[PDB]
């Protein structure tokens, strides 16, 4: 079984 | 009143969607129109949702905006796609609740006798998708869906809101939202019919007729006849293209653009522009379902002998029997003959002469390099599609090429044979009729496999046998003069011949390449050398 | 503009959004002749082109070429001529006294067509 490929990511910003 | 006083059906310019609009009015607006006393007596609740869907360019947005215009109430709120997402946490729900805050306030202030509020969501699938089946990068989408579900139907009851949602892929929407109380009425918009295609064409041409800018030779009914499978958007595009073609004839560009302005005040649109546009500019996005009979019949049919008429009459009789019978919903027939006899063209003609709603032809030309499973899947799909219509006719040609037969060993594919043998005896659903026409060139091989008994009848397609038929065929084609015809007759009339029409055409074309003083001789040799056959 | 028209969403191609669909393909002999004439106007105007160069012969010969390839052929031909007045043995030096009277001949075009530029289509 071929291991799952790499993935991107999504980011969320927070305000102080 | 709740309805604009000047509103009427005719003013919204909608096309052939009579039934759908009537169903909407019945199932969505019946309750609000009756006096409060009786509706209170029943004590029934009111609808709050609608979900339009269908293929692109059918009128969903037009219908939604026309419904908005029809109703007299607050200006509808529009959510233009995924404009509600924000990077800061918790602000998407802020907007999704700001939308409904005003309606909540009004209902609180006035109670049951308050006005109505309408909210329109466009590209709903962008926002609302299954909570479980989603990206794990952020839980923002799930929180949004939960907020919407809570607001639309939560512990607090709100009953003066109507929400309209339009999409193109209804499957992706979450199941929890498409339940009674949120969106129970769900319509499907589809391609129009001939009457709808006439009404649509009428709605746009109106102004040109009003101002006398359309030539009298234009027949709208004919245009509606030709334009098959088109949609409203494509019809409007065709009209625009014809207009542009008509307009282009008063400008001299390509060095510097100018306009006449004195010969340009007598403009008119003829039927030629429509014909030109229908072949060059606009092609139907939905692939034409009509078969390309020109490809299969590339040189027409010529009556060189009785057998042609006999075969056509037999085909007509079979068509009549399958059309006017109830004890035998399924019928089959096989056409057999020597190679180069024209079986495919005759089968195509027989199929065309009938006027069945559904007609399709399955050929190996498309199945190049396919495995023995892909062919089975394709045949299954074709037959499944055929099953839907009330009357169906299907043609299977070149059977031996469909089984991958080779006389060495021999070899063939068993799975396809079994699938065909099962599909030749499966009756369609109740109250439907199907006809199957098969073509082949080797009857003994089929006899060996014991499938010749699966068919109901057989028809024989002979090839030219006597010199008189050859002379008649030459006369019909008219490729030689009287002197050459006499010269050829002087020899051929003595004996018999055995040749197929396709090979005859090839021989004629090969012969016509020589100089005039030799062509006839070149012909005779080709007939003598290749003509050695029973 | 795209190179893979069949990967685009269908909803974007219906009339009213993107109607005019156009295909740009390889030119024919007349198009090749026109293109070749376009890219050689300045040299002819300034008398930098030799009198033995025949455009029609090149147009007939250059088969399966595209516009970029024709421009590249002209550019290589131009450099083969400029290189005859430079000395890159030890120190890069230019003549500057024979640079004037620079001319482009048919031999340069022929040489550039056999060792520098090769089409990427069909048999050759
Ligand atoms: N039934 C119709 N009657 C009259 N005009 C129509 C009809 N259907 C389409 N048209 C014309 O085609 C245009 C396209 O229709 P519309 O914008 O409503 O499509 P849509 O289904 O909402 O689009 P999509 O699914 O591509 O987002 C309409 O504005 C109108 O110009
Ligand atoms: N009277 C005719 N009957 C049949 N075909 C005809 C007739 N007159 C002309 N033709 C043309 O003869 C051509 C030969 O027909 P077709 O290719 O269908 O033959 P076929 O017997 O199925 O061939 P094959 O042996 O190669 O499988 C077709 O283009 C058909 O249009």
d(CA B119, CA B77): 5
Which residues have CB under 8 Å from B265's CB, separation 6+? none
Element (H, E) at B12: none
Query: Can you point out the beta strands (E) in B363-429?
Result: 391-396
φ/ψ of residue C86, rounded to 5: -130, 150
Binding partners of C (≥3 Cβ pairs within 8 A): B
Return the residue matching tokens 């952020």.
B138
Nearest CA to ligand 1 atom 29: B62
Known catalytic residue: B313?
no
Q: Are B174 and B72 in contact (CB under 8 A)?
A: no
> Please, what is the angle between helix C29-38 and helix C67-82, to 10°?
40
Per the annotation, does B180 bind a ligand? no
Q: Are B334 and B433 in contact (CB under 8 A)?
A: no
From B401, B478, B502, B508, mutation site for ligand 2 pocket: most ligand atoms within 8 A of C-beta = B502
Which residues have CB under 8 Å from B424's CB, separation 6+? B332, B436, B451, B454, B455
d(CA C37, CA C67): 12
Q: Which of B313, B340, B349 is nearest to B463 (CA)?
A: B340
Return the residue matching tokens 């559904």.
B358
Q: Closest chain B residue to A8 measured between Cα atoms?
A: B137
Q: Are B434 and B329 in contact (CB under 8 A)?
A: yes
Q: Which residues pair with B360 in a beta bridge?
A: B394
Q: Closest chain C residue to B57 measured between Cα atoms?
A: C14
Q: Which of B267, B250, B268 is nearest to B259 (CA)?
A: B250
d(CA B455, CA B334): 7
**Closest-CA distance of chain B to residue C10, Å:** 9
Per the annotation, does B151 bind a ligand? no
Known catalytic residue: B440?
no
d(CA B242, CA B253): 19
Burial (CB < 10 A; 0-12, 13-18, 19+), residue C8, is exposed
Element (H, E) at B390: none
C23 in contact with chain B, both atoms CB, cutoff 8 A: no
Tell me if there are at least 3 CB pairs under 8 Å linking chains A and B: yes
- The b/e string for B229-242 (b: 16+ C-beta within 10 A; e otherwise) is ebbbbbbbbbbbbb
Q: Are B61 and B166 in contact (CB under 8 A)?
A: yes
d(CA C99, CA B207): 71
Q: Are B31 and B5 in contact (CB under 8 A)?
A: no
Known catalytic residue: B425?
yes
C7 in contact with chain B, both atoms CB, cutoff 8 A: no
In Å, what resolution does this model reach?
A: 3.0
Per the annotation, does B302 bind a ligand? yes
**Closest-CA distance of chain B to residue A2, Å:** 22
* Catalytic residue from among B87, B221, B425, B481: B425
A10 neighbourhood in chain B, CB within 8 Å = 135, 137-138
Collapsing DSSP states into helix, strand and coil, what is residue B387? helix
Q: Do B285 and C16 touch (CB under 8 A)?
A: no
Between strands B391-396 and B433-440, the pairing is parallel
d(CA B51, CA B179): 11
Technique of determination: cryo-EM
From B345, B363, B464, B508, mutation site for ligand 2 pocket: most ligand atoms within 8 A of C-beta = B345
Side-by-side strand order, sheet with B457-460 = B358-362, B391-396, B433-440, B330-336, B457-460
Can you read off the two tokens belonging to residue B38? 């009786």
Return the residue matching tokens 């057989």.
B458
| Distances C70 to B398, B452, C57, C118 between C-alpha atoms, Å | 49, 63, 14, 10
Query: Can you point out the beta strands (E) in B341-451?
Result: 358-362, 391-396, 433-440
Burial (CB < 10 A; 0-12, 13-18, 19+), residue C98, is exposed
Known catalytic residue: B18?
no
**Closest-CA distance of chain B to residue A16, Å:** 11
Give the number of residues written for chain B: 534
Query: Can you point out the beta strands (E) in chain C?
Result: 86-87, 93-94
Q: Which of B25, B32, B43, B42 is nearest to B1 (CA)?
A: B32
Known catalytic residue: B343?
yes
Per the annotation, does B339 bind a ligand? yes
């Amino acid at each position: 079984m071929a291991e799952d490929a790499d993935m991107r990511n999504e980011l969320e910003e927070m305000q102080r | 009143s709740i309805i604009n006083p000047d509103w009427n059906f005719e003013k919204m310019g909608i096309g052939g969607l009579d039934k759908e609009f009537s169903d909407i009015f019945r199932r969505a607006f019946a309750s609000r129109v009756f006096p409060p006393e009786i509706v209170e007596q029943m004590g029934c609740k009111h609808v709050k949702g609608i979900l339009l869907y269908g293929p692109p360019g059918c009128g969903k947005t037009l219908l939604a905006r026309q419904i908005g215009k029809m109703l007299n109430a607050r200006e509808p709120k529009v959510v233009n796609g995924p404009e509600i997402l924000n990077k800061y946490v918790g602000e998407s729900e802020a907007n999704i609740r700001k939308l409904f805050a005003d309606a909540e306030e009004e209902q609180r202030r006035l109670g049951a006798n308050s006005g109505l509020h309408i909210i329109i969501f466009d590209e709903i699938d962008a926002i609302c998708k299954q909570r479980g089946s989603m990206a794990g990068s952020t839980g923002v989408h799930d929180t949004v869906v939960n907020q919407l579900l809570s607001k639309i139907d939560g512990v607090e009851q709100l009953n003066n809101i109507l929400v309209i949602g339009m999409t193109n892929r209804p499957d992706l929407i979450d199941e929890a939202l498409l339940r009674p109380g949120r969106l129970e009425v769900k319509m499907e918009i589809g391609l129009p019919d001939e009457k709808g295609r006439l009404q649509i064409l009428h709605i746009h041409t109106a102004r040109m007729r009003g101002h006398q800018l359309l030539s009298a030779d234009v027949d709208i009914k004919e245009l509606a006849v030709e334009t098959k499978n088109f949609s409203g958007a494509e019809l409007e595009g065709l009209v625009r293209a014809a207009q542009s073609t008509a307009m282009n004839r008063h400008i001299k560009a390509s060095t510097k653009v100018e306009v006449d302005m004195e010969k340009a005040e007598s403009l008119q649109v003829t039927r030629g522009d429509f014909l030109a546009s229908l072949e060059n500019d606009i092609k139907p996005a939905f692939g034409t379902n009509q078969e390309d009979y020109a490809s299969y019949i590339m040189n027409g049919i010529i009556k060189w002998g009785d057998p042609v008429t006999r075969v056509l009459d037999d085909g007509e009789l079979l068509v009549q029997q399958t059309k006017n019978s109830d004890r035998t919903p399924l019928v089959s027939v096989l056409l057999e003959g020597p190679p180069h006899s024209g079986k495919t063209a005759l089968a195509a003609k027989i199929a065309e002469e009938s006027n069945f709603p559904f007609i399709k032809i399955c050929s190996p030309d498309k199945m190049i390099g396919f495995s023995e499973t892909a062919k089975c899947q394709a045949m299954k799909k074709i037959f499944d599609d055929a099953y839907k219509s009330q009357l169906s006719c299907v043609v299977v040609d070149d059977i031996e090429r469909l089984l991958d037969y080779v006389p060495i060993g021999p070899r063939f594919s068993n799975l396809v044979l079994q699938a065909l043998l099962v599909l030749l005896k499966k009756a369609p659903p109740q109250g439907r009729k199907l006809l199957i026409i098969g073509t082949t060139s080797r009857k003994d091989v089929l006899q060996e496999m014991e499938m010749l008994n699966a068919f109901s009848t057989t028809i024989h397609v002979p090839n030219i046998a006597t010199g008189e038929q050859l002379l008649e065929a030459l006369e019909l084609l008219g490729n030689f003069k009287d002197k050459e015809r006499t010269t050829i007759a002087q020899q051929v009339k003595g004996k018999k011949v055995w040749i197929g029409i396709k090979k005859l055409l090839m021989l004629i074309e090969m012969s016509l390449q020589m100089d005039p003083e030799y062509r006839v001789r070149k012909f005779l040799a080709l007939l003598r050398e290749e003509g050695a056959s029973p």
